[PDB]
DNA sequence: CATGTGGGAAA
DNA sequence: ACACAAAATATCCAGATTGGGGACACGGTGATAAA
């Protein structure tokens, strides 16, 4: 269950970042193909830079404050604490399902 | 009489030379050390960066250049960088190969260079990581709508560090025939260096003068030293076993030592004593290196 | 009088030893032991290469030579290997064939040599790994094209510990003919071997003395030791009290061990104590293995 | 009185001692156990060997010996063995001979030979296997093609393990009139052993001196022990049950290494009722042995 | 502890939402009828979390972490436990620091 | 037992003032809720206007001179010792203590 | 040597109320809560005013230390006299 | 896709 | 030296903003032999 959130969270941050830095949603994109190509290609160089960044500092403290960037999207209200604890605690997966998020969009 | 071993440290200074990155707004600097506390350092290719800048201060040909263009970072290589270049290529560097063009670049020289004459390790702070930052600045716009940069006004960090640090370095005295004329210019150079920073617009920091123990033998690249001072830079306390029984009980002879500026400390009793050994004379750094080259060297 | 065993410990470095290879941009380091961490290690056949090129060092003629050419990893083979060639051969190496010519070329020696005269073991690092890493790159382009390397300036990583790390060694006493004179050499280079690792122009460290635990007796390979130092570098907490008693209780004998460098460690009226039955005297390693080796050998 | 018993360990050090091979050419430790974990074995013909080899070191007689020659694998036949052969054809060794030479080699001796004697086991590593492992060869080319090898060069991986293991043998009384001679020997080679393994130019490391417990009863072949060492090596737990309640008796124990431990207090109440005072392994050997024997 | 991460996301939002009503004197019962104050209600709200992110994300360490928490933060009415809580925190508090951080961040409005 | 002796010594401090300065035995407040209403504001009053006093002060002998002299500890007659003996780390981290512990109660 | 100050606060606290059953309790209470007007007088000191198991060595080492860190003393008599009442 | 709670201590 | 008392009320920040750009490795190689 918790996949789908992170991927949720991902899809999120890619188009929030993207739109609040170059104000260009979805529909306008659709507008004119130059707008898919621009839109596209800037899409593709946050991802990869969010990608390689991600890919190294593979531990717990600096893929936790790594983690601490994308400023948790999407988190929305907090049903559920098992989230916040056991999978803080494995700290293993959850690296795997971002970097299959990340490499997801392109 | 054929190896020269040295290590070389600094005055305390504040010293930011940021080198790391983040997004979050503070330029990290580098730590390796792991004992519970954390530790700067600075990388050798910059001191090497400055060595050769210091190199072409004097007058020294050589084939690498760094010029100032597009975004990319670039180098200038000018000729093929061949064994006989008289300063830089030379004393280090390499020559690369992808496709070798064609017979061994007419069969000349030899794209495997596997000597760098001067050998180099990092620096260690010596003194532990503290927290401080400093909220130096913030960004601020344009207004006249001319060449406009960023569009807000953001706000960042930075960090710095009240310390001294030291690095050790080593060379191998195997050539006599090229090598007099162009090490001269780098034992000067040591002497002096001046840079090994990001950008001294802000804490230049300079680490021209201080202590040194250089030490020459004929041990076949062997060294009793641990490449590390005190706090307060008196590490010459492991010697003083070794320096009383250089006659006798089976121990290091006399001519077993250097000197630098830690001999001006405050004590002259034992410095009377310790001159009948070793050549603990000169108060200068920058004149210790004008007389033990000579010596390590042909004349 | 037989067997000679011991195991050596080096000062605390920075070592880089880039040895693994990855897409991700970082040279990794070799990990072999599972208590929760990792630690780094060397390849035997590492040191081997150091040993034969300081064979190679001091006069001493040899039948394997390395070459730089193409870039399919060669070796000069010279002369065919003999058992009796004088350094290289003889002391450690075998003589491998596929086709072995006719009647093993005529009858002359044989074509199985039994193994190294001494026995090597891999190092430990004893101290727990860290993922820390250094920024230390940034490569450039060429400016005008002539001999360009690859076109774009990519970024990658580097990582460094700071450790200090022991191995062991041992060998059986079997020839005295010819053994002595290149038994003399190979001791004398065990006291000071340098390099063992791929990058000495950045990340310098020599290794070869801090401390040596030594034994020479007829009883056929038999080790008390555990090959393990402590951290702070003394071992002697569990063999205290196996060091004394020379005389009674059928415990190892006085002149079972020899000393080191740890000896010069602060408190001494226990030394005297440990005088009165073992050879815990010499404190350099050097002057040590000057002795033990005429002690060990017939003179 | 009649039957001696015994396992021994030894000291963590890296492994060695490969026999499989592989396709892509990376050297393989034995695997054995199937429940989840890995474990590295040693076949007992290899330390057999290597006692043979020992029992050579000392001045021993022998009908065989190993040959280093011609690439196939040969072992010299020298003369017809005999069971009064001083020391390794009485100690063990089978015969098998197809026509059985001339007459039952002239109705003399026995045609087949037992060997009997000496019992061994298999070495358990005690300790899981990890997928660790390293690449480490780089081979040369010749520059003068002098007796050339391999045109290519390639790179292969290779592992080892921080590990430490151990065996279980036994072996029964019943001859006195020779046996006490080689016995002696037997039991101070087997004190002290080394090699077992093909490369020793790397990975160099001796199994001989740890925690050694034996039990000489004349149980005929039963023992309470499982044959299993703690993993840290504080296997003591299995006494606890047992000495305590001294249903093994009081002299159905002896110590090893293991007796050095900084508690003293139960070591001794053990004392007046286990003879484990021995803290030097080579030690209990040369005394234990004479109590087996009949003098 | 599961249970004091319950509570720091709790003393987060009660802290957010108390700051808010003190300040600007603005309560979500009005929230009906009136999307004009839904606009300045999340333009409020915004500025108030992002000020209190950027504040605790600004520096890590020991004594900042822990004086800037127990000062600028008011944390929720409970009877005993939180000695317990506390001193359990003192041992080990970069955990803590993420799970505020994870809480307050939580807060952003959609869209 | 340590940070309990705080918690009951920053209770007891705060009853105590809230006493001196208005009638005590809150269980006399019963149901008049404008009763309830005062009290909570006089007790916020109280407790705020501690928390700025102690805010405003936490550098070494100053935070000392002021918390010892205005508060009221309980007797503690003999496991008080270890309580002093420490006293460095002790206000180190007590500063904290007794921030925690004060704006643990409001209203 | 904190539970030195302690007892010699308490003994000499004692000492003035012995040198001047409801009513024995309400007695001592009423009495212990007037001599904290002596301390409230002591506490408003600053450097310099009003200055058992032995006397000889006390004056020959306490003194001593009595000059060196009487900053720390100031926490002392407040402290534990408030301790009592 | 969102807010909640009390009360004591000593020769 | 007796006794008396050891302070009282209002208030504890306000607004604007939290990095920008270019680039994340190049080449050569994957074991021979006896049962």
Redesign the interface.
């Known amino acids: 269950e918790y996949a789908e959130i992170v991927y949720k969270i991902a899809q999120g941050f890619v188009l929030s970042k993207l739109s609040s830095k170059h104000d260009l949603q979805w529909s306008k994109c659709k507008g004119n193909p130059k707008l898919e190509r621009e839109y596209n290609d800037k899409k593709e160089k946050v991802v990869n830079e969010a990608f390689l960044a991600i890919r190294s500092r593979t531990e717990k403290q600096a893929f936790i404050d790594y983690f601490v960037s994308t400023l948790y999207p999407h988190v929305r209200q907090d049903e559920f604490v098992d989230f916040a604890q056991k999978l803080f605690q494995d700290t293993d997966e959850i690296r795997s399902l971002t970097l299959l998020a990340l490499s997801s969009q392109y | 009489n054929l190896n020269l071993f040295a290590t070389i440290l600094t005055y305390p200074a504040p010293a930011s030379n940021y ?3 983040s ?2 707004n503070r330029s990290v600097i ?5 004992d519970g506390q954390k530790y700067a ?1 600075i ?3 910059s001191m090497r960066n400055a060595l050769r800048e210091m190199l072409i201060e004097l007058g020294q040909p050589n084939n690498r250049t760094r ?1 100032h ?1 597009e975004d ?10 061949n064994p006989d270049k008289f300063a830089d290529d030379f004393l ?1 560097g390499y ?2 190969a ?1 496709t070798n063009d064609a017979k061994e670049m007419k069969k000349l020289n ?1 794209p ?1 260079k ?1 000597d ?1 004459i ?5 620096a260690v702070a010596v003194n532990p990581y503290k ?1 401080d ?1 400093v909220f130096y600045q913030s960004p601020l716009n344009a207004g006249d709508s001319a060449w406009k940069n960023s569009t807000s006004s953001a706000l960042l ?1 930075r960090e710095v560090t009240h310390t001294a640090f030291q690095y ?3 060379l191998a005295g195997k050539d006599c025939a090229a090598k007099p004329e162009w090490v001269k210019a780098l034992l000067q150079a040591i002497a002096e260096l001046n840079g090994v920073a990001g950008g001294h617009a802000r804490a230049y920091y300079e680490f021209a003068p201080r202590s040194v123990v250089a030490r020459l033998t004929p ?6 030293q ?2 590390g001072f005190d706090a307060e830079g008196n590490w010459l306390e492991l010697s003083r ?1 070794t320096a009383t029984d250089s006659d006798n009980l ?3 002879a006399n001519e077993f030592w250097l000197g630098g500026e830690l001999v001006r400390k405050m004590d002259q009793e034992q410095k009377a004593q310790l001159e009948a050994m070793g050549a603990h004379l000169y108060a200068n750094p920058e004149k210790l290196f004008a007389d033990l080259a000579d010596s390590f060297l042909g004349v």
């Open positions: 080198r790391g990155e997004e979050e580098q730590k390796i050390l792991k350092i990388s050798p290719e010029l263009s990319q970072l670039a180098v200038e290589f000018k000729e093929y960088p280090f020559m690369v992808q030899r495997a596997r760098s001067f050998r180099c390790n990092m927290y930052t960090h050790p370095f080593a041990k076949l690249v062997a060294g009793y641990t490449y076993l089976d121990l290091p």
